[PDB]
């Protein structure tokens, strides 16, 4: 495995929309493996490929141990219900936290490492993390949705 450098705001790669993954190959699997440990070593709960300099629709989230690691390739949100307001941060903006409103429940369609399509339902913090990472894949950063930063 390799500890990948996490790209910090500012950097253009962070605002670049990502291409869909077309080849589900060994390089993709290594990217995901490296991203997950890099993310945890940095005490993060989500990480998207553009944050490690790769413009592909690939992200991973890992909040609870029971749930565990969820790798998302070419994810799309099929349904959103309810709202939740709370603090949000990002490994690409060290120490920056702001209040962001996100859907509370989401239904997500995405592919795994082999290209198989799965359906995932999430709520609360996990749903917040997933929404934040999917935004990265479209070149959107959380600062664009912060309503207020904390003192």
18 is in an annotated binding site: no
For the chain, the residue count is: 151
Q: By beta-carbon distance, which residue lies closest to Ni ion?
A: 90
The Cα–Cα gap between 49 and 57 comes to 7
Q: Catalytic residue positions?
A: 133
18 Rama class: left (phi>0) / alpha (psi -120 to 50) / beta:
beta
Q: Considering beta carbons, is residue 23 or 144 the nearer one to Ni ion?
A: 144
Q: Which is nearer to Ni ion, 96 or 120 (CB)?
A: 96
What is the Cα–Cα distance from 119 to 110, expressed in whole angstroms?
7
Chain positions contacting Ni ion, by CB under 5 A: 90
Residue 132 CB, nearest approach to Ni ion (Å) = 5
Find out whether 136 is annotated in a ligand binding site.
Answer: yes
Annotated binding residues for Fe cation, written as ranges, equal 90, 132, 136
């Amino acid at each position: 495995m390799a500890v990948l450098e996490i790209i910090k705001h500012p950097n253009e790669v962070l605002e670049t929309p990502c291409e869909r993954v077309i080849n589900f190959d060994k390089k993709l699997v290594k990217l995901l493996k490296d991203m997950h440990e890099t993310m945890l070593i940095a005490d993060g709960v989500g990480l998207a490929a553009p944050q490690v300099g790769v413009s592909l629709q690939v992200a991973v989230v890992d909040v609870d141990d029971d749930t565990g690691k969820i790798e998302l390739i070419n994810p799309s949100i099929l349904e959103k219900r309810g709202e939740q307001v709370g603090p949000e941060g990002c490994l690409s903006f060290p120490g920056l936290y702001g209040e962001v409103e996100r859907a509370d429940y989401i239904k997500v369609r995405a592919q795994n490492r082999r290209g198989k399509v799965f359906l995932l339902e999430a709520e609360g913090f996990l749903a917040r993390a997933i929404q934040h990472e999917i935004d990265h894949l479209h070149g959107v950063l959380f600062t664009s949705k912060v309503t207020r930063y904390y003192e």
